[PDB]
């Protein structure tokens, strides 16, 4: 299928971003009828909830990196 940007954006899985975009009453009533769960995949939902966006320094690829010197690492190695 091929649909314009408006209809593609309003048809997403996340009801928070679609509700904050446009046609709020329709999106909200459909999501409430369906009991939709928003999994917070995109950026708009995390911004709305005031969370750390899954991009840049908030990406799971890099945000669990640790840093340590050589002296502290050796002490833990002896332990």
């Amino acid at each position: 299928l091929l649909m314009g940007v408006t209809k593609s954006a309003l048809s997403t899985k996340s009801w928070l971003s679609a509700a904050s975009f446009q046609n709020t009453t329709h999106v909200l009533t459909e999501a409430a009828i369906a009991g939709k769960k928003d999994e917070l995949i995109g950026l708009k939902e995390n911004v709305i909830l005031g969370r750390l966006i899954p991009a840049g320094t908030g990406s799971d690829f890099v945000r669990f990196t640790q840093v340590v010197d050589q002296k502290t690492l050796k002490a833990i190695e002896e332990a």
Binding site: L43, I53, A55, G56, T57, S59, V62
Partner: protein, 40 residues
């Protein structure tokens, strides 16, 4: 912006939207022009 392979974690969707939208403001005149881009 760095002339090197993109880093993992880059929000390329936002970058794409801004890249398309910036010139359209004022640069693209107004079937032809901005209406053509919007129609497409």
């Amino acid at each position: 912006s760095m002339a090197r392979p993109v880093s993992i974690g880059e929000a390329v969707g936002i970058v794409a939207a801004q890249s398309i939208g910036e010139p359209g403001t004022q640069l693209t005149m107004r079937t032809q022009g901005l209406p053509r881009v919007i129609e497409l």
